[PDB]
Amino acid sequence: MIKIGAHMPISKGFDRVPQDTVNIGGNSFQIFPHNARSWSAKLPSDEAATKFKREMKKHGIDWENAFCHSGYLINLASPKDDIWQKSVELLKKEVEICRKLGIRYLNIHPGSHLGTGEEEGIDRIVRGLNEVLNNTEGVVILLENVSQKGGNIGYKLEQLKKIRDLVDQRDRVAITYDTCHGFDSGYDITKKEGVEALLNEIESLFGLERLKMIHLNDSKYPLGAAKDRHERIGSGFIGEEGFAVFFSFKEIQEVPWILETPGGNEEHAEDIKKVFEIIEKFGIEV
């Protein structure tokens, strides 16, 4: 079946997310683990966590379709030690928030070396991940591919594998594929050859079961732009045709599609409708 959803607001409480998900036509979702302004974040209370799990059960949300996404502050590739340390300590807290909520996945951008070098930046990420993983249990951290802006690490899937193969607990590191970041970086999912090459690269670098989530974003810019601006499904340079090709692969259908396109619940409900519209219009099986 198609597993699809969106990044959901948590400002009215975690427990409202399951209901909001089915109300936009989804059965999967992504959420921030908190709304902290700085390096310290609160845990959900026992009460909040219980309500969240109860609503999850009520609405039958598959726990393999529910993700947390870490915030913008954390940078494990930071050349600043104090930023690296604080980032490490906040990520641990975020893992513990996931544990409390029952969330199995925490998704992050690997980091930015801010112009101090990709190789040293990768080692820092690796070391940060070790400190986090070796001091926590259960939760799997997902590495997201990103756009090639500034010192971003991870715009090539090769970079995610270099990080992952050096981590102590590899089984607790997996992969998220963002279609907009990939498109920025030359990954052409608008052609079947492109999708096939993507799949082969994922299979060879990590194995296909390491692909835990797809961030389904159209792009404001052409293939290779490296611009990192998301676009509504069907309104960008990937388009209805591009996504139709992408959707035709069973390997792609196996993974939850999570929207990070502009707007909120209202706009995302439309994108979800658009996805099924594309599926119907182009005669995609299923």
Q: Closer to Zn ion at the Cβ: 71 or 117?
A: 71
Distance CA 47, CA 101 (A): 11
Tell me whether residue 260 is annotated as binding. yes
Q: Closer to Zn ion at the Cβ: 69 or 244?
A: 69
In the complex, minimum distance from the CB of residue 54 to Zn ion, in angstroms, rounded to a whole number: 28
Cis amide linkage into residue 22, ω under 30° from 0: no
In the complex, minimum distance from the CB of residue 147 to Zn ion, in angstroms, rounded to a whole number: 10
Which positions lie near Zn ion, rule CB under 5 A? 144
Tell me whether residue 178 is annotated as binding. yes
Using Cβ positions, the residue closest to Zn ion within the complex turns out to be 144
Q: Closer to Zn ion at the Cβ: 144 or 184?
A: 144
Token readout for 273 is 């409708």
Distance CA 55, CA 244 (A): 33
Distance CA 196, CA 252 (A): 10
Tell me whether residue 181 is annotated as binding. yes
Distance CA 184, CA 54 (A): 39
Distance CA 279, CA 249 (A): 12
- The number of beta carbons lying within 10 Å of the beta carbon of residue 12 is 9
In the complex, minimum distance from the CB of residue 210 to Zn ion, in angstroms, rounded to a whole number: 17
Q: Closer to Zn ion at the Cβ: 108 or 279?
A: 108
User: Contact 206/212 with Cβ under 8 angstroms?
Assistant: no
Distance CA 150, CA 113 (A): 8
Tell me whether residue 89 is annotated as binding. no
In the complex, minimum distance from the CB of residue 280 to Zn ion, in angstroms, rounded to a whole number: 29
Tracing tokens 């599609």 back to the chain, one arrives at: 257
Tell me whether residue 69 is annotated as binding. yes
Q: Closer to Zn ion at the Cβ: 144 or 188?
A: 144
- The number of beta carbons lying within 10 Å of the beta carbon of residue 63 is 11
Tracing tokens 């990420």 back to the chain, one arrives at: 125
Tell me whether residue 113 is annotated as binding. no
In the complex, minimum distance from the CB of residue 193 to Zn ion, in angstroms, rounded to a whole number: 27
In the complex, minimum distance from the CB of residue 252 to Zn ion, in angstroms, rounded to a whole number: 19
Decide: helix, strand or coil at residue 175.
Answer: strand
Q: Closer to Zn ion at the Cβ: 177 or 246?
A: 177
Tell me whether residue 188 is annotated as binding. no
For the annotated binding site for Zn(2+), the residues are 69, 109, 144, 178, 181, 215, 228, 230, 260
For the annotated binding site, the residues are 69, 109, 144, 178, 181, 215, 228, 230, 260
